[PDB]
Write a protein that holds these residues in place. Structure first.
Motif, PDB file in Angstrom:
ATOM      1  N   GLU A 262       0.999  -1.249  -0.146  1.00  0.00           N
ATOM      2  CA  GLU A 262       0.015   0.104  -0.223  1.00  0.00           C
ATOM      3  C   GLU A 262       0.858   1.218  -0.086  1.00  0.00           C
ATOM      4  OE1 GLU A 262      -3.138   0.616  -0.440  1.00  0.00           O
ATOM      5  OE2 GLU A 262      -4.018  -1.406  -0.242  1.00  0.00           O
ATOM      6  N   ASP A 263       1.872   1.346   1.003  1.00  0.00           N
ATOM      7  CA  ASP A 263       2.931   2.515   0.902  1.00  0.00           C
ATOM      8  C   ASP A 263       3.585   2.645  -0.645  1.00  0.00           C
ATOM      9  OD1 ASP A 263       1.797   3.236   3.038  1.00  0.00           O
ATOM     10  OD2 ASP A 263       3.754   2.505   4.421  1.00  0.00           O
ATOM     11  N   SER A 264       3.715   1.545  -1.300  1.00  0.00           N
ATOM     12  CA  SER A 264       4.413   1.663  -2.558  1.00  0.00           C
ATOM     13  C   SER A 264       3.396   2.129  -3.494  1.00  0.00           C
ATOM     14  CB  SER A 264       4.869   0.244  -3.068  1.00  0.00           C
ATOM     15  OG  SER A 264       6.036  -0.356  -2.165  1.00  0.00           O
ATOM     16  N   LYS A 265       2.183   1.716  -3.438  1.00  0.00           N
ATOM     17  CA  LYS A 265       1.162   2.120  -4.225  1.00  0.00           C
ATOM     18  C   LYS A 265       0.912   3.787  -3.967  1.00  0.00           C
ATOM     19  CE  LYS A 265      -3.744   1.501  -5.469  1.00  0.00           C
ATOM     20  NZ  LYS A 265      -4.254   2.719  -5.064  1.00  0.00           N
ATOM     21  N   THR A 266       1.029   4.302  -3.061  1.00  0.00           N
ATOM     22  CA  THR A 266       0.906   5.771  -2.427  1.00  0.00           C
ATOM     23  C   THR A 266       1.990   6.249  -2.959  1.00  0.00           C
ATOM     24  OG1 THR A 266      -0.346   5.541  -0.707  1.00  0.00           O
ATOM     25  CG2 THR A 266       0.934   7.279  -0.700  1.00  0.00           C
ATOM     26  N   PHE A 267       3.343   5.808  -3.006  1.00  0.00           N
ATOM     27  CA  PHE A 267       4.391   6.460  -3.448  1.00  0.00           C
ATOM     28  C   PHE A 267       4.528   6.654  -4.921  1.00  0.00           C
ATOM     29  CE2 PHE A 267       8.840   5.915  -5.457  1.00  0.00           C
ATOM     30  CZ  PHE A 267       9.090   7.071  -5.052  1.00  0.00           C
ATOM     31  N   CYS A 268       3.978   5.484  -5.703  1.00  0.00           N
ATOM     32  CA  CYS A 268       4.195   5.696  -7.098  1.00  0.00           C
ATOM     33  C   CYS A 268       2.970   6.871  -7.533  1.00  0.00           C
ATOM     34  CB  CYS A 268       3.796   4.405  -7.821  1.00  0.00           C
ATOM     35  SG  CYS A 268       5.067   3.408  -7.792  1.00  0.00           S
ATOM     36  N   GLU A 269       2.081   6.986  -7.084  1.00  0.00           N
ATOM     37  CA  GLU A 269       1.009   8.304  -6.955  1.00  0.00           C
ATOM     38  C   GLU A 269       1.611   9.506  -6.914  1.00  0.00           C
ATOM     39  OE1 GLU A 269      -2.237   6.998  -4.277  1.00  0.00           O
ATOM     40  OE2 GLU A 269      -2.664   5.231  -5.718  1.00  0.00           O
ATOM     41  N   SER A 270       2.376   9.656  -5.897  1.00  0.00           N
ATOM     42  CA  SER A 270       3.227  10.786  -5.324  1.00  0.00           C
ATOM     43  C   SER A 270       4.010  11.191  -6.566  1.00  0.00           C
ATOM     44  CB  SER A 270       3.773  10.728  -4.252  1.00  0.00           C
ATOM     45  OG  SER A 270       5.127  10.256  -4.391  1.00  0.00           O
ATOM     46  N   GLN A 271       4.374  10.154  -7.491  1.00  0.00           N
ATOM     47  CA  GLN A 271       5.509  10.401  -8.348  1.00  0.00           C
ATOM     48  C   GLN A 271       4.555  10.637  -9.750  1.00  0.00           C
ATOM     49  OE1 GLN A 271       7.701  11.011  -5.800  1.00  0.00           O
ATOM     50  NE2 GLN A 271       9.015  10.755  -7.775  1.00  0.00           N
ATOM     51  N   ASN A 272       3.441  11.184  -9.725  1.00  0.00           N
ATOM     52  CA  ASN A 272       2.595  11.113 -11.047  1.00  0.00           C
ATOM     53  C   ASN A 272       2.549   9.937 -12.089  1.00  0.00           C
ATOM     54  OD1 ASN A 272       0.926  13.108 -12.572  1.00  0.00           O
ATOM     55  ND2 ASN A 272       2.682  12.953 -14.107  1.00  0.00           N
ATOM     56  N   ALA A 273       2.726   8.706 -10.964  1.00  0.00           N
ATOM     57  CA  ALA A 273       2.701   7.467 -11.568  1.00  0.00           C
ATOM     58  C   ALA A 273       1.717   6.433 -10.992  1.00  0.00           C
ATOM     59  CB  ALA A 273       4.163   6.909 -11.666  1.00  0.00           C
ATOM     60  N   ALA A 274       1.877   5.180 -11.201  1.00  0.00           N
ATOM     61  CA  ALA A 274       1.308   4.199 -10.481  1.00  0.00           C
ATOM     62  C   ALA A 274       2.160   2.921 -10.635  1.00  0.00           C
ATOM     63  CB  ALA A 274      -0.039   3.895 -11.039  1.00  0.00           C
ATOM     64  N   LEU A 275       1.912   2.047  -9.400  1.00  0.00           N
ATOM     65  CA  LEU A 275       2.636   0.623  -9.752  1.00  0.00           C
ATOM     66  C   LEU A 275       2.326   0.142 -10.885  1.00  0.00           C
ATOM     67  CD1 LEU A 275       1.872  -0.721  -6.107  1.00  0.00           C
ATOM     68  CD2 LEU A 275       4.263  -0.376  -6.971  1.00  0.00           C
ATOM     69  N   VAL A 276       3.549  -0.314 -11.382  1.00  0.00           N
ATOM     70  CA  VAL A 276       3.709  -1.072 -12.981  1.00  0.00           C
ATOM     71  C   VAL A 276       2.378  -2.094 -13.117  1.00  0.00           C
ATOM     72  CG1 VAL A 276       5.122  -2.866 -12.344  1.00  0.00           C
ATOM     73  CG2 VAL A 276       4.926  -1.883 -14.605  1.00  0.00           C
ATOM     74  N   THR A 277       1.703  -1.952 -14.275  1.00  0.00           N
ATOM     75  CA  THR A 277       0.841  -2.926 -14.751  1.00  0.00           C
ATOM     76  C   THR A 277       1.447  -3.603 -16.049  1.00  0.00           C
ATOM     77  OG1 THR A 277      -0.426  -1.507 -15.992  1.00  0.00           O
ATOM     78  CG2 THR A 277      -1.109  -1.477 -13.796  1.00  0.00           C
ATOM     79  N   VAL A 278       1.289  -4.835 -16.131  1.00  0.00           N
ATOM     80  CA  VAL A 278       2.063  -5.644 -17.120  1.00  0.00           C
ATOM     81  C   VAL A 278       1.014  -6.377 -18.192  1.00  0.00           C
ATOM     82  CG1 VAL A 278       3.844  -7.559 -17.506  1.00  0.00           C
ATOM     83  CG2 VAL A 278       3.663  -6.150 -15.397  1.00  0.00           C
ATOM     84  N   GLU A 279       1.054  -5.641 -18.940  1.00  0.00           N
ATOM     85  CA  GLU A 279      -0.200  -5.925 -20.292  1.00  0.00           C
ATOM     86  C   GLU A 279       0.255  -6.995 -21.224  1.00  0.00           C
ATOM     87  OE1 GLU A 279       0.355  -2.424 -19.178  1.00  0.00           O
ATOM     88  OE2 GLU A 279      -1.526  -2.200 -18.211  1.00  0.00           O
ATOM     89  N   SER A 280       1.451  -6.985 -21.514  1.00  0.00           N
ATOM     90  CA  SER A 280       2.211  -7.854 -22.444  1.00  0.00           C
ATOM     91  C   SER A 280       3.022  -8.506 -22.176  1.00  0.00           C
ATOM     92  CB  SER A 280       2.572  -6.918 -23.400  1.00  0.00           C
ATOM     93  OG  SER A 280       3.788  -6.024 -23.485  1.00  0.00           O
ATOM     94  N   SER A 281       3.612  -9.731 -22.843  1.00  0.00           N
ATOM     95  CA  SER A 281       4.803 -10.397 -22.827  1.00  0.00           C
ATOM     96  C   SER A 281       6.071  -9.576 -22.927  1.00  0.00           C
ATOM     97  CB  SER A 281       4.952 -11.693 -23.286  1.00  0.00           C
ATOM     98  OG  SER A 281       5.094 -11.314 -24.925  1.00  0.00           O
ATOM     99  N   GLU A 282       6.182  -8.645 -23.912  1.00  0.00           N
ATOM    100  CA  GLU A 282       7.099  -7.657 -24.112  1.00  0.00           C
ATOM    101  C   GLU A 282       7.619  -6.829 -23.136  1.00  0.00           C
ATOM    102  OE1 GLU A 282       4.317  -8.297 -26.204  1.00  0.00           O
ATOM    103  OE2 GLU A 282       4.761  -8.040 -28.134  1.00  0.00           O
ATOM    104  N   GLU A 283       6.411  -6.552 -22.058  1.00  0.00           N
ATOM    105  CA  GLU A 283       6.696  -5.343 -21.383  1.00  0.00           C
ATOM    106  C   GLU A 283       7.145  -6.415 -19.966  1.00  0.00           C
ATOM    107  OE1 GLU A 283       4.428  -1.971 -18.452  1.00  0.00           O
ATOM    108  OE2 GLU A 283       3.128  -3.425 -19.497  1.00  0.00           O
ATOM    109  N   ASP A 284       6.637  -7.701 -19.931  1.00  0.00           N
ATOM    110  CA  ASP A 284       7.254  -8.481 -18.875  1.00  0.00           C
ATOM    111  C   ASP A 284       8.785  -8.925 -19.032  1.00  0.00           C
ATOM    112  OD1 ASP A 284       6.523 -10.657 -16.625  1.00  0.00           O
ATOM    113  OD2 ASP A 284       7.383 -11.928 -18.412  1.00  0.00           O
ATOM    114  N   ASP A 285       9.094  -8.804 -20.344  1.00  0.00           N
ATOM    115  CA  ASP A 285      10.622  -9.325 -20.694  1.00  0.00           C
ATOM    116  C   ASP A 285      11.309  -7.963 -20.266  1.00  0.00           C
ATOM    117  OD1 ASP A 285       9.691 -11.795 -21.792  1.00  0.00           O
ATOM    118  OD2 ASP A 285      10.022 -11.410 -23.699  1.00  0.00           O
ATOM    119  N   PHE A 286      10.854  -6.918 -20.716  1.00  0.00           N
ATOM    120  CA  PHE A 286      11.545  -5.604 -20.091  1.00  0.00           C
ATOM    121  C   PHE A 286      11.870  -5.495 -18.706  1.00  0.00           C
ATOM    122  CE2 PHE A 286      11.025  -1.325 -18.361  1.00  0.00           C
ATOM    123  CZ  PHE A 286      12.342  -0.950 -18.661  1.00  0.00           C
ATOM    124  N   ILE A 287      10.722  -5.688 -18.044  1.00  0.00           N
ATOM    125  CA  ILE A 287      10.783  -5.787 -16.503  1.00  0.00           C
ATOM    126  C   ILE A 287      11.893  -6.691 -15.896  1.00  0.00           C
ATOM    127  CG2 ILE A 287       9.807  -5.970 -14.398  1.00  0.00           C
ATOM    128  CD1 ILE A 287       7.144  -4.674 -16.036  1.00  0.00           C
TER     129      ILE A 287
END
Ligand SMILES: [Ca+2]
Ligand SMILES: [Ca+2]
Lengths: 138, 137
Positions: B28-53
């Motif tokens: 939860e504090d990580s979720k908050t932190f990403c929000e504070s960065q004008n971002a969000a915890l990563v969501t992984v829609e594709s195998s391409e993105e999975d590979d990158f991460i």
């Protein structure tokens, strides 16, 4: 991400890339080879800011109404994407486009396509200018 | 995001900027932190993105798990990305998720080789996290 000093003479700097708006007269395939000859690629457009920069340059002249860019149909991909194999992120098609003609992309200025993307069937024999990009990426 | 638009310390891939943040926080504090960065915890829609991460996190060995933007959605009664979207790409580690009512990480431990695991304490288990932004408005 290039710095300004990475850009060869006659190339324009924007957003970590160097660009050549070349006015030679080549088909799309010839234009792809041309950009490769300059250790570059036909331009790939990842965001709206880059799209805006390009539109600024193209709307600053009136001699040309289309320029080849680095996207074409790929049958194994079964889609339109950039020639590096990367899918579109920013979507820059003009209104009513694409025609889905399994063609090659340009920026076009005609009627409701106001310096936006179009797909053209003939990737070899329709001669036009092109945009090359050096992006100093991995 | 433009390819050269990312903040210092962030990396670009696939139209997004990512932060592999090494400060250890509960999910939860990580979720908050990403929000504070004008971002969000990563969501992984594709195998391409999975590979990158996987490419980034597998190249270090200080950390064995990172929090990501998936968790149990009680209404749907399944794991969903934190934007509410279904998990279309199967990046789970073998025999995962083990249990309902958890939050998700990439984990590197035994049979799970930089794949997703479900952890049932979304508050008090402190680890690094991955933020994603698409630089919209
Ligand atoms: Ca570009
Ligand atoms: Ca994503």
């Amino acid at each position: 991400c290039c710095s300004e000093d990475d850009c060869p003479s006659g190339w324009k700097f924007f957003g970590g890339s160097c660009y050549l708006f070349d006015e030679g007269s080549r088909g799309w395939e010839g234009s792809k080879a041309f950009c490769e000859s300059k250790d570059a690629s036909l331009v790939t457009v990842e965001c709206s800011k880059e799209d805006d920069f390009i539109r600024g340059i193209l709307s600053g002249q009136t001699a040309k109404h289309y320029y080849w860019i680095g996207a074409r149909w790929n049958e194994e991909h079964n889609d339109y994407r950039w020639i590096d194999g990367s899918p579109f992120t920013f979507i820059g098609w003009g209104p009513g486009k694409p025609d889905n003609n399994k063609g090659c992309l340009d920026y076009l200025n005609y009627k409701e396509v106001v310096w936006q993307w179009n797909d053209h069937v003939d990737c070899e024999n329709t001669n036009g200018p092109c945009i090359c990009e050096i992006d100093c990426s991995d | 995001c433009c390819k050269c638009d990312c903040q210092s310390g962030w990396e670009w891939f696939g139209g997004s900027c990512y932060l592999f943040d090494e400060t250890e926080r509960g999910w939860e504090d990580s979720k908050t932190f990403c929000e504070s960065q004008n971002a969000a915890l990563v969501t992984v829609e594709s195998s391409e993105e999975d590979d990158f991460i996987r490419g980034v996190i597998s190249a270090q060995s200080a950390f064995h798990y990172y929090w990501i933007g998936g968790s149990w959605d009680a209404e749907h009664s399944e794991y969903r990305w934190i934007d509410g979207s279904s998990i279309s790409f199967n990046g789970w580690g073998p025999n995962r998720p083990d249990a309902d009512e958890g939050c998700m990480d990439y984990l590197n431990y035994k049979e799970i080789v930089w794949q997703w695991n479900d952890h049932q304490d979304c508050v008090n288990t402190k680890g690094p996290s991955i933020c994603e932004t698409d630089c919209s408005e």
